[PDB]
Amino acid sequence: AEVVNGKLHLRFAIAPMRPTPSQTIKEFEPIFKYLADQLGATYEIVSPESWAAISVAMTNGHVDVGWLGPWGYVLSNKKAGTEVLATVKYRGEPFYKALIVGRADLPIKKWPEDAKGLKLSLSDQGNTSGWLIPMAYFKSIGIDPASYFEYREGATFGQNESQIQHGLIDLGSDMDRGRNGMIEAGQIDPSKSKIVWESSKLPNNAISVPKDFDPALKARITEILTSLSEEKAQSLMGSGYNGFVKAKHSDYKVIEDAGRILGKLLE
């Protein structure tokens, strides 16, 4: 937070919501422009190439207000004391759930023991809902997925869902917003799969600021974002994103617990 031409000037950053920084900034700059306008501030906006990159940018002091992912926030909080102000709503909900999905014909009476030795497909390690959360779940009950299952990492959620539906793999990670989107789009037949495990609620994101960011501004940013009507918030953001709720660190407990058990919060 600095002064330029006699005015507050803010550095904003948006996670990679869309396949390119250009497309992300096109669709999400409006909520940031709105925020800066409501403060009478000028601004800069960047969109790093990865969810990890925006966490690093915030940690390394390059960002006044960041749209971080939940794990990016928790890590940045641990490393630099980054504070969360709010969480974005998608179709009115500020949270999602990580899933493990299975072929509909899998005989699973006891989870996960009945699935021992089956194929499991998790995502690339940088994906919170596809890897961090389910891997932390297995570790939390004494399971090493690489030894317990016929295990693969690196699949996309679309690969997992299509391969499950076609009977080629057994279990795969997904997240509920994504699975629903694929059903709505007619891209998968949900009768051929079932949810065998769901996480607790995970916050969609974290609107974040540095440690010791001016308390007056924190409050004002929170008020400006949480005051938005569904229609006004949606007019300023990509499809589905339609409000903000006030947030606090404890909302991220499931995320923090997962990073904790995988040794990702050790100094």
Author numbering: 2 to 268
What does the original paper state about this entry?
P. stutzeri WM88 has PtxABC, HtxBCDE and PhnCDE ABC-transporters for the acquisition of phosphite, hypophosphite and organophosphonates, respectively. These transport systems rely on a high-affinity periplasmic binding protein (PBP) to impart ligand specificity. HtxB is a typical type-II PBP, with a binding pocket positioned in a deep groove between two domains separated by a hinge region. A comparison of the HtxB and PtxB structures showed that sequence differences within the binding pocket essentially eliminate an oxygen binding site in HtxB, providing specificity for a ligand with two oxygen atoms (hypophosphite), over one with three (phosphite).
To probe the role of the D206 in ligand binding we generated D206A and D206N mutants of HtxB. The D206N mutation renders D206N HtxB incapable of binding phosphite or hypophosphite at pH 5 or 7.4, as determined by MST with up to 100 mM of ligand. Superposition of the ligand binding domain (residues 95–204) from D206N HtxB with WT HtxB shows that N206 points away from the ligand binding site in the mutant protein, rotated ca. 180° away from its position in the closed WT complex, and therefore, not in a position where it can interact with R178. We note that residue 206 sits on one of the two hinge regions of the protein (F96-K98 and P204-N206), suggesting it may have some flexibility. In the D206N HtxB structure, the sidechain oxygen of N206 sits within hydrogen bonding distance of the V89 amide (2.9 Å), altering the mainchain bond angles and rotating the N206 carbonyl by 50° away from its position in the WT/D206A HtxB structures. This change in mainchain conformation results in a 180° flip in the N205 carbonyl, requiring N205 to adopt a different rotamer in the D206N structure and leading to a new hydrogen bond formed with R178. It seems likely that this rearrangement of the mainchain very close to the hinge region, together with the concomitant change in the hydrogen bond network across the domain interface might result in the D206N HtxB mutant being unable to form a closed conformation in complex with phosphorus ligands, explaining why no ligand binding could be detected for this mutant in our solution studies. Comparisons of the D206N structure, which crystallised in a partially open conformation, with open and closed complexes from closely related proteins suggests that D206 and R178 are positioned on flexible regions of the protein that are brought into close proximity during domain closure.
